Ligand binder design. Structure first.
Ligand code: BMF
Length: 125
């Protein structure tokens, strides 16, 4: 790595999830999106109590306005993005590609996270 900072190791992995298929879904807050209708955004607040997204996590890592205290909170927040998407959207029908996109980015995240030194950088800091 030759980095030493665990937060940059988190940002590196976040930037790699941005290159995944339909990554635009998880980039900005769904509740701020002008693309979705208010009807769907009002059901979202009822179904999802804690919304999250990549730009919100990225801004929380740069704090060093909340701040991510450790890799364990970063892991929670990234996985929260994919579980909210998989709770809100169906895994069957014509628009099942939204759920499937969350599922594949979660799978990509686990593979990057499991082979990362992010905890060894945090533990030795
Ligand atoms: C059939 C009804 O269901 C839905 O439309 N579902 C969801 C839709 C979108 C969504 C759409 C369009 C755009 C352009 C974006 N990108 S953004 C938020 O950065 O502006 C996201 N995100 N999403 C997330 C997460 N979780 N569920 C959904």
């Amino acid at each position: 790595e030759a980095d030493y900072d665990w937060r940059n190791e988190c940002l590196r992995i976040l930037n790699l999830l941005r290159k995944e298929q339909n990554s635009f879904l998880f980039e900005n807050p769904v509740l701020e999106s002008n693309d979705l209708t208010e009807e769907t955004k009002n059901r979202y607040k009822e179904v999802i109590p804690e919304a999250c997204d990549y730009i919100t996590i990225e801004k929380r890592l740069n704090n060093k306005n909340q701040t991510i205290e450790n890799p364990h909170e970063f892991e929670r927040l990234v996985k929260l993005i994919f579980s909210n998407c998989m709770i809100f959207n169906p895994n069957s029908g014509e628009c099942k590609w939204i759920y499937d996109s969350a599922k594949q980015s979660l799978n990509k995240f686990n593979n990057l996270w499991n082979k990362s030194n992010v905890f060894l950088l945090y533990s030795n800091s």
